[PDB]
UniProtKB/Swiss-Prot annotation, chain A:
This is Small ribosomal subunit protein mS23. InterPro entries: Ribosomal_mS23_fun. The keyword Disulfide bond does not apply. Its main location: mitochondrion. The lineage of its organism: Eukaryota, Fungi, Dikarya, Ascomycota, Saccharomycotina. GO terms for cellular component: mitochondrial inner membrane; mitochondrial small ribosomal subunit; mitochondrion. It is found in: Mitochondrion. It comes from Saccharomyces cerevisiae (strain ATCC 204508 / S288c) (Baker's yeast). Component of the mitochondrial small ribosomal subunit (mt-SSU). Mature yeast 74S mitochondrial ribosomes consist of a small (37S) and a large (54S) subunit. The 37S small subunit contains a 15S ribosomal RNA (15S mt-rRNA) and 34 different proteins. The 54S large subunit contains a 21S rRNA (21S mt-rRNA) and 46 different proteins.
Swiss-Prot record, chain B:
This is Small ribosomal subunit protein mS42. GO terms for molecular function: metal ion binding; structural constituent of ribosome; superoxide dismutase activity. Keywords: Mitochondrion, Ribonucleoprotein, Ribosomal protein. Present with 2060 molecules/cell in log phase SD medium. Component of the mitochondrial ribosome (mitoribosome), a dedicated translation machinery responsible for the synthesis of mitochondrial genome-encoded proteins, including at least some of the essential transmembrane subunits of the mitochondrial respiratory chain. The mitoribosomes are attached to the mitochondrial inner membrane and translation products are cotranslationally integrated into the membrane. The keyword Ribosomal protein applies. Component of the mitochondrial small ribosomal subunit (mt-SSU). Mature yeast 74S mitochondrial ribosomes consist of a small (37S) and a large (54S) subunit. The 37S small subunit contains a 15S ribosomal RNA (15S mt-rRNA) and 34 different proteins. The 54S large subunit contains a 21S rRNA (21S mt-rRNA) and 46 different proteins. mS42 forms a heterodimer with mS43, building a large protuberance adjacent to the mRNA channel exit in the mt-SSU body.
UniProtKB/Swiss-Prot annotation, chain F:
Present with 2010 molecules/cell in log phase SD medium. It comes from Saccharomyces cerevisiae (strain ATCC 204508 / S288c). Belongs to the mitochondrion-specific ribosomal protein mS26 family. Component of the mitochondrial small ribosomal subunit (mt-SSU). Mature yeast 74S mitochondrial ribosomes consist of a small (37S) and a large (54S) subunit. The 37S small subunit contains a 15S ribosomal RNA (15S mt-rRNA) and 34 different proteins. The 54S large subunit contains a 21S rRNA (21S mt-rRNA) and 46 different proteins. It is found in: Mitochondrion. Disulfide bonds: none annotated. Component of the mitochondrial ribosome (mitoribosome), a dedicated translation machinery responsible for the synthesis of mitochondrial genome-encoded proteins, including at least some of the essential transmembrane subunits of the mitochondrial respiratory chain. The mitoribosomes are attached to the mitochondrial inner membrane and translation products are cotranslationally integrated into the membrane. The chain holds residues 266 to 300 of 318 of the full protein. It comes from the Eukaryota. This is Small ribosomal subunit protein mS26.
From Swiss-Prot, chain G:
Transmembrane segments: none annotated. Component of the mitochondrial ribosome (mitoribosome), a dedicated translation machinery responsible for the synthesis of mitochondrial genome-encoded proteins, including at least some of the essential transmembrane subunits of the mitochondrial respiratory chain. The mitoribosomes are attached to the mitochondrial inner membrane and translation products are cotranslationally integrated into the membrane. One of its GO terms (cellular component) is mitochondrial small ribosomal subunit. It comes from Saccharomyces cerevisiae (strain ATCC 204508 / S288c) (Baker's yeast). The keyword DNA repair does not apply. This is Small ribosomal subunit protein bS21m. Present with 1270 molecules/cell in log phase SD medium. GO terms for biological process: mitochondrial translation; mitochondrial translational initiation. Keywords: Mitochondrion, Ribonucleoprotein, Ribosomal protein, Transit peptide.
Length: 237, 257, 101, 196, 300, 35, 59, 92
RNA sequence: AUAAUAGUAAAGAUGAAAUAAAUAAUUAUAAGACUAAUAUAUGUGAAAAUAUUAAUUAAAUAUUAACUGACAUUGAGGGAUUAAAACUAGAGUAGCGAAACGGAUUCGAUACCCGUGUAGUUCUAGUAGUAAACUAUGAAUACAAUUAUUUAUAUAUAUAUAUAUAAAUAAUAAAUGAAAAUGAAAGUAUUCCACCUGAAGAGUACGUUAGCAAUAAUGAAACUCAAAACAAUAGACGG
């Protein structure tokens, strides 16, 4: 769509109405808009760096910067075809944001498929309040989940305790297993201890599933019977 | 995040404890330490889940019927119960920190003493206190809670819980210790309760209970050991029931105005 | 009657997880709708990377991409890439001319 | 989605992530502050502020925003012609005279004064992509407008754009609330200068 | 900066997934991350995604692939039912055990080269574990590797004549052994598939350690009884065991001696009735499935 | 292995070492070491 | 079953199309139009499936 | 890889004759069975007694029973409502 | 088409009809032409064209390395190639099929439909250089906002996707336009060539050139008129 002109110039078109006398009274917005000018450039802006990984955009490596031979054993003495194509479009295309943590996150849930079954809440509370010390995995305010492992792994690589990402990741994974085992026992024991003191529960999870399966299996029984009788009539033909 | 509530006159509580019941060290254990311990564990259990936005009392009701959330229920029940106990044993609910008030003479109200006579066959408050001390010593072998509760029929009665047993929801009162032996009468009560829970049509298998606590006494080791010692929990319960804050206990009885 | 048509009952494999919905008729219909020969790739030589033109003297393999009368199947049915469809058709036509297909 | 990109918003984009464009919040904050000052100015000047949003769930935010700024809102449907054909649509409805404290003067209005077009001094649009009619009428009527501009929305159609997600009720209600409180402060400053 | 915050945002925490939301094959484990919204946010169609979820959705759990699409909709399915399968497994209190008696994957054990005696079995698994690899990208594992291995020729042309010269002058049966070890020794420093994507142990289904007994008011529980359903009225063809549906898992049920007479009577409607089962053991296979073995406890 | 390979179907390494006095200057080297 | 083979090998259609001669240009036009209609129907069905999916989710 | 086919801009998205599932009449299936029962066991055979009794009740008041399954498809209402949103058309 | 075989009395055709030991079936032999699916003319080719198989010869792609050092673009005249029909010779001739002769239809039927079917359609060697030979859009270069879908090359790995750069196609922004629409041109610019200047007369007459010929190229004027044409709009009508 064409860059519109009349929406940002209401003050100037109004000013012509007032100066000529076509409009007798100044509108209430008139003074407010005059003191706060609208932005009216609507230009495309170049970008020279990917904010996620700091990669520089718009830099050409000259042959003088590649004095040594390549992986093929050949020296570079002249620009190649790619070097001779204008790359202005890359300056204007929104950069693809990438993060190393994304690679680890995919790995964690590939190794632990059932961690996906633990519901995650995407609704944020207040990102600015998060005061986390990733020297330890547990944190007050956030659940223990795959993200706890990833942030712990990054802290280890950031503090240079471990050099390889794999080693830091493995170290964090074991800390995660220990915390997961202590919680699986606290829940089992809590249920056992309550039943031993006379706690009663209406429906268990296993019972809930049986009831839901019965509701479905009852409708399925009717339809099967109905469709096993239309077939008999239709086939009789 | 669940945080420990601020208590009125906290500077006095951290210096002279609760007069006639707990010392400064004893009160730091029961409230400043244990309440922090509970709230932190509750935050770790509930952070990242829908339960984080609910107050502990609402959490226990929501989780009362879920067997595998008992850990969350225990923490929520303990937190709510502990602040019910710390609230009625507190010198003054109003913050006389700048008023330096040292005259808080609270006595049972007329509505409370009228319901006591009606529900206890004319027994006096002093006699009922003796029954409460006896019930705690013979029904709670270990940790637990002592409550004076009111039901939907306007009758005050005494309920004791083992460990973290809620007074609000009878299926989770935990009033019978099944580790030891039970009489046929106790088994009948448990069997009758199970039948009531099975009559509910809700998919969550939950029943309606309108019981509400009036007095709460913490029978956990975090409240008495340091000041009374093993075996002296009956001297602790006697002091608590004799130095209750009746401005809070009277307000817990529904009047209807 | 103690019998149901196989088309009206779902047999849950062993080791798999299920939901209550898996016992409904919707699951039966949903499985029919989304029933595609996706396992062919692993059993489809021509979707593996081999050159179909190397099979011009192996009528048995080529006979898997023609109808009962010998009509070459359209790419919409074979699911091959343009190049493999082009090469496969040449292989079949060459095989027919040699006297093998 | 990057597939729905309107390249005229290129300057507002921070990058693309997970198949969607990320709006630059540094610019959103500067635009939001500028837009907020405009709402406050118009409110402090006694102008009519109309809040337009027709996506499901927006009514609650729209009604409270109008209430705390002494403004107006439309949550159901923008009648095409409300501003350009105001006499055939809005002439029948009742007007009133008010003092500097926004209290009804109670003076009966002559039929001449009750038929005159009452044009908004500022139009706020939560979902401009579905309110092209309202935006074009505001342009024709020289009414300054504020709107949330998503990556697929045309920035030049509004005087003061606010780059931001227009699909989430949380994002919309967060931005609407800020503008509504800005108006409230302007209203309170106008009522305060009258007292003293 | 905004980029740093975005990387740590809750949406970034969800790993990219384009697996079909409507899958009709065999399901062995969860494929999508369950998203949950609170009741208050559900009332306002807020899920923390890009756009509001339609008000028709009353469930508080969903799974999605794309935040937005060219169709101007979110790709999601309003279901969160794999969590109930995990919680029902927890209620059955059957720890997952290794049928091969392997070390527990969740403990940092001090392992030794007992299984490393198959260096030629797994060093070549990198090039031979190419079941589903492209015909030319897999062929790029032949020239790319050959150059890398061919760059160590000088190192192995000196080490072998300095550590085992006799073999070079007698037989190559031992030389081949020194070659397999050489590359591995020079590859352990390298990073070839340094990250292993294989499922680790249970995959998160259960973190329960075997050994603990279940105390109950009626004494210690010795046999776990769980309601279930028989799916087929005729044993699995070619197998001596029927199939049961217990707690969201399909198990192999072994009968004491005979099959109850309700089978023949019910016929193909046998799944309409609930039986009591005993869960003997639970194992984990490499595909990520759970091998649950049960026993049809019949009233006696 | 290259020149010092046991494969019946060897590569040009073996023929290169022969004409470069390597397979001979190593055979003597190994034999001298054995001495 | 035999009739199904005839229709899956287009035997009846081919026989009818061989009764009269058609100019090569006309043959090409008919082949182009038929392909377009086949492809158009596939695009139509793809859009209907999206509609049904969108309706199911409340859009 | 499965070839997606994208339509050009269209004046409408409509199914010419929306298919509907028309449940079979209960009285007609009863008549089709009784007629078959007479074909095998013979006309008036005692084996078809129940069929005759059921047929009489089904048709007693209306020869086609209480037909109350009439249905119309809503695909065209939704197709026209959602087409502009989901067609993937470029911006103006 | 012919022959054999048993087996018969109709067959064939059409809107319905009628004209000219069979038809059908199973074998055997001969001939000419054509090339089902795949298939999208996708692709390829300067265009015309090009889709049963193999071979021989020729040409054709991308990237990288090195090399030449403006050697380029366009192109009057000129040259080459150029569907179908046609023509000149020598073969071939199944099927199809101008014409011709018949049968029908019809008020009539020098037609549409049917029969018999000559040239032609086929091959070899030539002539000729015309088509709605069309994308009704000459070629080249620089440049401008998006999406989708394929294809190719390259890169990466936690190995099958992901990330890049081109090409093609589809839908578009801007721009352009009488509008329909065009969309990387029918946009922004540059360079070269061809061509046009109201309708009708007329691509005609005459002359010339070329051809075996049919013809092809080149190509007017007089008289007459105030017309003539395109896109789009609302109607009316439609066997
Ligand atoms: K072509
Ligand atoms: K020069
Ligand atoms: K030249
Ligand atoms: K020329
Ligand atoms: K002929
Ligand atoms: K030209
Ligand atoms: Mg939006
Ligand atoms: Mg014959
Ligand atoms: Mg063909
Ligand atoms: Mg083409
Ligand atoms: Mg030229
Ligand atoms: Mg042709
Ligand atoms: Mg001739
Ligand atoms: Mg005639
Ligand atoms: Mg005649
Ligand atoms: Mg004829
Ligand atoms: Mg020629
Ligand atoms: Mg001519
Ligand atoms: Mg011409
Ligand atoms: Mg042509
Ligand atoms: Mg050229
Ligand atoms: Mg001429
Ligand atoms: Mg026209």
């Amino acid at each position: 769509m064409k860059i519109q002109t009349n929406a940002v110039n209401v003050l100037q078109r109004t000013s012509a109405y007032l100066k000529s006398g076509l409009l007798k009274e100044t509108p209430a917005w008139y003074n407010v808009v005059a003191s706060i000018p609208p932005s009216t450039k609507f230009t495309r802006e170049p970008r020279f760096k990917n904010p996620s990984n700091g990669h520089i955009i718009g830099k050409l490596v000259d042959v003088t910067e590649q004095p040594h031979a390549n992986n093929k054993g050949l020296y570079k003495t002249r620009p190649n075809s790619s070097d001779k194509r204008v790359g202005v479009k890359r300056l204007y295309r929104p950069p693809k944001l990438t993060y190393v943590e994304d690679r680890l996150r995919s790995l964690f849930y590939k190794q632990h498929p059932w961690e996906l079954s633990r519901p995650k809440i995407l609704v944020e509370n207040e990102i600015g309040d998060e005061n986390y010390d990733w020297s330890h995995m547990l944190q007050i305010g956030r659940p223990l989940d795959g993200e706890s492992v990833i942030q712990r792994t990054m802290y280890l690589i950031k503090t240079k305790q471990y050099g390889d990402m794999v080693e830091a990741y493995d170290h964090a994974r074991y800390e995660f297993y220990a915390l997961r085992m202590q919680e699986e026992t606290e829940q089992q024991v809590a249920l056992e201890e309550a039943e031993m003191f006379g706690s009663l529960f209406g429906v268990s999870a296993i019972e809930h599933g049986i009831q839901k399966e019965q509701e479905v299996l009852d409708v399925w029984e009717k339809k099967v019977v109905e469709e096993t009788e239309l077939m008999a009539a239709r086939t009789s033909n | 995040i669940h945080v420990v509530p601020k208590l009125p006159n906290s500077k006095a509580l951290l210096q002279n404890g609760v007069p006639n019941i707990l010392s400064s060290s004893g009160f730091k254990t029961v409230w400043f330490d244990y309440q922090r311990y509970l709230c932190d564990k509750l935050t770790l259990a509930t952070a990242g889940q829908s339960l984080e936005s609910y107050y502990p009392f609402h959490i226990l009701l929501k989780t009362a019927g879920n067997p595998l959330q008992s850990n969350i229920f225990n923490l929520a029940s303990s937190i709510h119960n502990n602040h019910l106990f710390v609230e009625n044993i507190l010198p003054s609910a109003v913050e006389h920190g700048t008023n330096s008030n040292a005259v808080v003479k609270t006595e049972p109200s007329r509505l409370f003493l009228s319901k006591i006579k009606d529900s206890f066959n004319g027994s006096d408050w002093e006699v009922v206190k003796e029954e409460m001390i006896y019930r705690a010593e013979n029904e709670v072998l270990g940790q637990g809670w002592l409550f004076l509760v009111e039901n939907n029929e306007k009758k005050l009665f005494i309920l004791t819980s083992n460990n973290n047993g809620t007074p609000y929801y009878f299926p989770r009162n935990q009033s019978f210790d099944l580790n030891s032996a039970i009489s046929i009468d106790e088994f009948a009560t448990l069997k009758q309760m199970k039948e009531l829970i099975g009559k509910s049509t809700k998919l969550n298998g939950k029943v309606q209970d309108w019981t509400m606590p009036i007095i709460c006494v913490n029978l956990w080791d975090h409240a008495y050991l340091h000041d009374y010692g093993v075996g002296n929990r009956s001297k602790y319960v006697k002091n608590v029931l004799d130095n209750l804050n009746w401005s809070v206990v009277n307000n817990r009885i529904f009047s209807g105005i | 009657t103690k019998k149901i048509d196989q088309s009206l009952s779902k047999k849950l494999p062993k080791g798999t997880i299920y939901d209550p919905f898996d016992f409904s008729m919707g699951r039966i219909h949903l499985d029919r709708k989304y029933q595609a020969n996706k396992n062919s790739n692993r059993n489809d030589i021509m979707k593996s990377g081999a050159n179909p033109l190397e099979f011009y003297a192996r009528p048995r393999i080529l006979s898997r991409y023609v109808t009962s009368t010998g009509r070459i199947q359209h790419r919409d049915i074979t699911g091959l890439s343009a190049k493999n469809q082009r090469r496969l058709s040449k292989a079949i036509r060459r095989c027919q001319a040699i006297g093998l297909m | 989605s990057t597939s729905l990109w309107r390249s005229s918003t290129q300057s507002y984009i921070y990058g693309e992530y997970k198949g969607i464009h990320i709006i630059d919040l540094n610019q959103t904050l500067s635009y939001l502050k500028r837009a907020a000052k405009v709402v406050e100015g118009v409110s402090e000047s006694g102008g009519i502020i109309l809040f337009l949003g027709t996506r499901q769930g927006q009514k609650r935010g729209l009604e409270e925003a109008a209430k705390k700024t002494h403004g107006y809102y439309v949550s159901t449907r923008w009648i095409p012609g409300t501003l350009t054909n105001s006499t055939e649509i809005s002439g029948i409805w009742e007007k009133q005279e008010i003092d500097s404290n926004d209290n009804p003067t109670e003076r009966a209005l002559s039929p001449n004064e009750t038929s005159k077009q009452v044009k908004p001094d500022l139009l706020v649009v939560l979902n401009p992509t579905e309110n092209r009619n309202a935006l074009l009428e505001a342009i024709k009527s020289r009414v300054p407008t504020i709107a949330i501009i998503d990556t697929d929305s045309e920035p030049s159609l509004v005087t003061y754009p606010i780059p931001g997600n227009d699909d989430s009720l949380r994002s919309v209600n967060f931005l609407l609330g800020v503008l509504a409180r800005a108006g409230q402060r302007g209203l309170q400053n106008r009522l305060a200068r009258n007292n003293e | 900066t905004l980029a740093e915050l975005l990387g740590r945002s809750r949406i970034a925490q969800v790993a990219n997934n384009h697996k079909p939301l409507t899958y009709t094959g065999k399901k062995f484990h969860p494929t999508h991350q369950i998203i949950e919204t609170k009741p208050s946010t559900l009332y306002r169609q807020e899920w923390g995604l890009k756009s509001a979820i339609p008000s028709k959705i009353k469930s508080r759990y969903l799974v999605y692939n794309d935040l937005d699409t060219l169709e101007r909709i979110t790709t999601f399915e309003p279901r969160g039912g794999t969590q109930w399968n995990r919680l029902r497994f927890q209620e059955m209190g059957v720890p997952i055990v290794s049928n091969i008696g392997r070390q527990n994957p969740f403990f940092k054990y001090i392992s030794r080269p007992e299984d490393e005696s198959h260096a030629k079995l797994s060093l070549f698994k990198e090039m031979k574990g190419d079941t589903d690899i492209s015909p030319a990208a897999m062929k790029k594992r032949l020239k790319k590797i050959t150059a890398l291995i061919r760059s160590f020729q000088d190192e192995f042309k000196e080490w072998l004549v300095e550590n085992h010269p006799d073999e070079l002058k007698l037989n190559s049966n031992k030389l081949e052994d020194y070659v397999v070890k050489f590359l591995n020794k020079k590859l352990e420093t390298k990073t070839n598939k340094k990250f292993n994507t294989e499922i680790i142990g249970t995959g998160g289904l259960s973190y329960s350690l075997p050994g603990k007994l279940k105390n109950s008011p009626n004494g210690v529980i010795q046999r776990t009884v769980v309601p279930g359903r028989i799916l087929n009225v005729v044993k699995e063809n070619n197998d001596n065991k029927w199939l049961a549906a217990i707690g969201g898992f399909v198990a192999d049920v072994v009968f004491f001696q005979s099959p109850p007479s309700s089978f023949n009577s019910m016929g193909d409607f046998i799944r309409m009735k609930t039986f009591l089962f005993e869960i003997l053991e639970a194992s984990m296979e490499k595909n990520g499935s759970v091998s649950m073995h049960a026993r049809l406890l019949e009233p006696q | 292995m290259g020149s010092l390979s046991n494969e019946k179907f060897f590569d040009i390494s073996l023929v290169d070492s022969y004409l470069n006095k390597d397979l001979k200057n190593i055979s003597n080297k190994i034999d001298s070491k054995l001495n | 079953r035999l009739n199904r083979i005839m229709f899956e090998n287009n035997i009846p259609g081919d026989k009818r199309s061989q009764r009269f001669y058609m100019k090569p240009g006309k043959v090409a036009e008919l082949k182009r139009s038929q392909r377009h209609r086949k492809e158009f129907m596939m695009g139509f069905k793809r859009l209907i499936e999206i509609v049904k999916d969108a309706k199911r989710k409340g859009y | 890889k499965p070839p997606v086919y994208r339509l050009p801009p269209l004046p409408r998205l409509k199914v010419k004759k929306p298919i509907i599932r028309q449940e079979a009449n209960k009285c007609l299936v009863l008549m089709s069975n009784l007629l078959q029962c007479w074909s095998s066991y013979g006309h008036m055979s005692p084996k078809c007694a129940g069929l005759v009794t059921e047929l009489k009740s089904c048709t007693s008041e209306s020869a086609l029973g209480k037909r109350n399954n009439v249905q119309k498809s809503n695909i065209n209402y939704h197709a026209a409502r959602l087409y502009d949103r989901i067609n993937g058309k470029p911006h103006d």
